[PDB]
């Protein structure tokens, strides 16, 4: 069972795993079917861009909050600021997300500008007009790319004022670590006469 | 060099379809070519074979032998022509069947349907 110097391997194969084996022979066929579905749907919605307009959103965790990605839909605050109602926005092709809240001024501004330029670029055919055939483009995502916002210039002046940036980190961690103890001590010193 | 997806280049499927085809398909299968003079007269290359078509065996051991069609055996994929038979040792003559692709049609049995077929295939009557 156990043998020469080898790593301990944990191979979870003592169920009837052979009955649940999925081999993806249909990878190429599924890709072809997906492209066909995109083509036929685009033909069905022929003047429309085959996808919706998504907002700029900041990725949640401390591992990813350095990056900006696509959201689910624009907030109701964002659509109001862009100057249109949520229902009409949904009809003319903006993804509206009701449960997302904007606490962020620059994400607010970036999404409002996204909406403003979207309204500038698209043209809506009137219900009973003359249908100005308009050479459909097939990707709102590619037409309005998500751009990571630049933070500061490449070269700026050096400002040193003598904190070493390590003592500040240590002291911040220590203050967090001992805040409750110090508050309790202040409480006891106040309450004892 | 097939280009459609509904056309199969499968030997098994093609052979099965050939051997299993019903009489309506066996007619088109047993289409036979026309003579030089008949091609000149009609403008049409090959036609499904019929019963009173005059034909010329132009391949095989009965090379260059004329006759009138006696019966197209769609079940046996053959055509039996008048006066092309075999003499058995007991003295009875048995029809020899032959494939219409090895034939040349020298005279057609015409009617309204055959004339409409010639016209539809491009013939001039």
């Amino acid at each position: 069972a156990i043998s020469k110097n080898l790593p301990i391997l944990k191979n979870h194969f003592r169920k009837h795993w052979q009955e649940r084996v999925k081999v993806h022979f249909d990878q190429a066929g599924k890709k072809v079917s997906r492209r066909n579905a995109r083509a036929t749907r685009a033909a069905k919605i022929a003047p429309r861009p085959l996808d919706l307009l998504r907002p700029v959103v900041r990725a949640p965790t401390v591992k990813y909050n350095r990056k900006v990605r696509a959201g689910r839909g624009f907030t109701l605050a964002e659509v109001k600021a862009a100057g249109l109602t949520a229902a009409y926005a949904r009809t003319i092709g903006i993804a509206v997300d009701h449960r997302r809240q904007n606490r962020n001024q620059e994400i607010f501004d970036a999404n409002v500008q996204r909406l403003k330029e979207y309204q500038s670029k698209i043209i809506v055919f009137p219900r009973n007009g003359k249908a100005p055939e308009a050479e459909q483009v097939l990707s709102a995502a590619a037409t309005f790319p998500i751009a990571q916002p630049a933070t500061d210039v490449e070269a700026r002046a050096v400002q040193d004022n003598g904190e070493s940036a390590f003592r500040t980190l240590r002291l911040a961690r220590s203050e967090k670590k001992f805040r409750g103890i110090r508050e309790k001590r202040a409480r006891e010193k106040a309450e004892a006469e | 060099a097939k280009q459609s997806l509904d056309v199969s280049s499968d030997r098994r499927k093609a052979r099965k379809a050939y051997f299993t085809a019903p009489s309506s398909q066996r007619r088109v299968l047993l289409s036979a070519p026309l003579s030089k003079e008949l091609r000149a007269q009609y403008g049409i290359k090959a036609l499904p074979i019929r019963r009173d078509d005059e034909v010329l065996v132009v391949r095989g051991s009965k090379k260059g032998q004329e006759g009138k069609i006696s019966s197209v055996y769609r079940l046996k994929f053959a055509v039996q022509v008048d006066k092309v038979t075999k003499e058995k040792v007991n003295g009875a003559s048995v029809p020899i069947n032959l494939h219409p692709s090895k034939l040349v049609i020298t005279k057609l049995h015409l009617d309204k349907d055959r004339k409409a077929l010639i016209q539809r295939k491009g013939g001039k009557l």
Binding site: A1, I2, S3, K4, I8, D152, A155, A157 | -
Partner: protein
Amino acid sequence: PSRFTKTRKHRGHVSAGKGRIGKHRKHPGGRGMAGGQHHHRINMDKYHPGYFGKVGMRYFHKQQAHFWKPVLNLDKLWTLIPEDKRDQYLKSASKETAPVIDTLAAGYGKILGKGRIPNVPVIVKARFVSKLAEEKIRAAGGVVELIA
């Protein structure tokens, strides 16, 4: 390729390389890690000491995104700035134009001081910095400002 295997070479010989006395039986030692305390204890103790038991604390619902913190050393620091600009900055090694390096944008959490950056000034935007890393940047004449 099957044609390259030793089964093809054992074709002809009775036991197929498995021995006459001790045959190739099914599971003469157990299945898997059987008997790690009893009859494979010698292998376990020689080759995998520390196998049996538990030592530390537990951590229910541990998230690896909390502990995401790749480390950048000073020697690799200068590779964060674009290569064509590198000679430019090295030659124009001076204050009031130092390049700001966003290690967090590059994908690093902490700056460690593996040592010997040139004595040019440079702005190191980090969110964690080692004592020696900050000391060496200050010695070079740059500064590290902390970000989040």
